[PDB]
């Protein structure tokens, strides 16, 4: 039983490389980038304009995930 | 990779543990890329009392491409044509990898309670809808009884 | 004992309004905002240039916190 | 505003839980806005075998303003004047609210081990240090014995 907020809004799976967009949404780099490069340059959730360079590595979450991975 | 399969398996999980109201869905064979979903005509709509069947085909590069969703049962509706094609922006230009079949399903339902004639697919029904809206329900409930009951 | 990644780099207290910087570092809006005003326009940790308008809401983290504020 | 006090308290709770190597700190009576700290000679420095006392005074903007840290124990060092004033980056231009007293204490130990003669508070020692290294160690040793032993 994996919480949702630890899964990618695209992959639906746990996040390996979490990173947040300016709209304040976290994706898994590999998936969010596949989207920006094949679908369009917008936030899959807010649809605001978005581009690879605008992705900040959500370090906090990255830890939070490691934590969860320990006890599981 | 075959992330599509992993994504589809997860979606199915969610969809089946909490299915859109009035709806139901599941893979056909062990083909998680070929689903069949069914919808109960909503409770005010002249579609009320009918059972509608649709086919959902997930493209190999899902969820980056939208799913192919079509009505296999006949329906008198302005946004759904004779060969089960549904006119719902979200299934076309407005598709987003973040959306899910469950969401699409919900739209189709609400789209059954509130047709959008300003963006037709079947002009006549769209017209009959705009003007003689009473004649619309007459033929809608008629088709439901003849093709969905 | 609260996990660390769920606390402010400044406040050290649990995070009420977690927002991220382009450095991946997450602070509590209140604290980091005063720092930018009283201390300077740089990331408290990385020290790279930073302005208040660059702070992004770390929503994922906002719900990871609530999630913790659950069992406790 | 009183967040300062809350923060200072966590630091103290933290500090006394896992003291920086060679160091020790704790409140000086009441208001945690005032601390006492002792540092054992850097073993590795000519200050070895010496015990030094410092006073930490937290401003009201803490942690937005660096703590006021000073030696009370006399010490022969180019970066510390006879008033126990310490020329530390991390106490001046390089301060950050992300830094801690603990860190400051390690930084000070580091400084004992390796003085920074180019940014002195005592030109004269800075000189001896850079020119006659030995004379420097001798006096430091002598002063440690006389004032910190
Ligand atoms: Cl994702
Ligand atoms: Cl987020
Ligand atoms: Cl903070």
Numbering used by the authors:
A (entry chain D), C (entry chain C): 207 to 278
B (entry chain B), D (entry chain A): -1 to 147
Paper passage:
We crystallized a complex of the Zebrafish CHIP U-box and UbcH5a and solved its structure to 2.9 Å resolution by molecular replacement. The crystal asymmetric unit contains a back-to-back U-box dimer, with each U-box bound to an UbcH5a molecule. The U-box conformation and dimerization mode are essentially identical to those in previously described structures of free CHIP (rmsd < 0.4 Å), emphasizing that the U-box undergoes negligible conformational change upon binding to an E2 enzyme. The N-terminal α-helix (UbcH5a-α1) and two prominent loops, UbcH5a-L4 and UbcH5a-L7, comprise most of one side the protein and interact with the CHIP U-box, contacting a hydrophobic groove formed by the interface of CHIP-L1, CHIP-L2 and CHIP-α9. The interface buries ~700 Å2 of solvent-accessible surface area. The interactions are arranged around a central hydrophobic patch, in which the sidechain of UbcH5a-F62 protrudes into a concave surface formed by aliphatic portions of sidechains from both loops and helix α9 of the U-box. The phenyl ring of UbcH5a-F62 also stacks against the guanidinium group of CHIP-R263, which is held in position by a salt bridge with CHIP-E259. An additional interaction is formed by planar stacking of the aromatic sidechain of CHIP-F237 against the guanidinium group of UbcH5a-R5, which leaves the arginine sidechain free to participate in an extensive intra-UbcH5a polar network. On this loop, the motif S-P-A (residues 94–96 of UbcH5a or residues 96–98 of Ubc13) makes a hydrogen bond with the carbonyl group of CHIP-P269 and van der Waals contacts with CHIP-H260, V264 and V270.
